[PDB]
């Protein structure tokens, strides 16, 4: 759609990684806070 690649990313796929790495990131921010 947005690009000519034959494996063009979907927005849900992009956000899926964001949700996966979020729990690890939240734990570190507790210490930083």
């Amino acid at each position: 759609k947005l690009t000519s690649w034959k494996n063009e990313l979907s927005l849900q796929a992009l956000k899926a990684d964001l949700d996966a790495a979020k729990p690890s990131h939240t734990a570190m921010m507790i210490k930083v806070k």
Partner: protein
């Protein structure tokens, strides 16, 4: 929180940028790409423009942790010393302030 400019051309919105490697050709090779979305709509998707071909972020640790990404500040070691120092100092003030003079 309450700040918001009325002019639509100068409104402030939050955008997300994704920098990483993806199998764009679906054959097994990884390529650096960048994607940008605002409010569940894709607005940009293209290969990495910078010649370096890697993430444009740089990380600096203060006290490095063994085989770990983040760092340790000196505030970690001084947590208990500060608390005890405050209790002692407040004890002296409570002794002078609460007495007759």
């Amino acid at each position: 929180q309450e700040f918001q400019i009325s002019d639509p051309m100068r409104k402030r919105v939050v955008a997300y940028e994704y920098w990483g490697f993806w199998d764009i050709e679906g054959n097994g090779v990884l390529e650096p790409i960048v994607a940008t979305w605002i409010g569940s709509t894709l607005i940009r998707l293209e290969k990495n423009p910078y010649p370096d071909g890697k993430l444009p972020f740089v990380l600096i640790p203060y006290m490095p942790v063994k085989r770990d990404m983040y760092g340790e500040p000196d505030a970690e070691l001084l947590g208990d010393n500060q608390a005890v120092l405050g209790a002692v100092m407040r004890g002296m003030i409570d002794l002078l302030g609460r007495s007759a003079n």
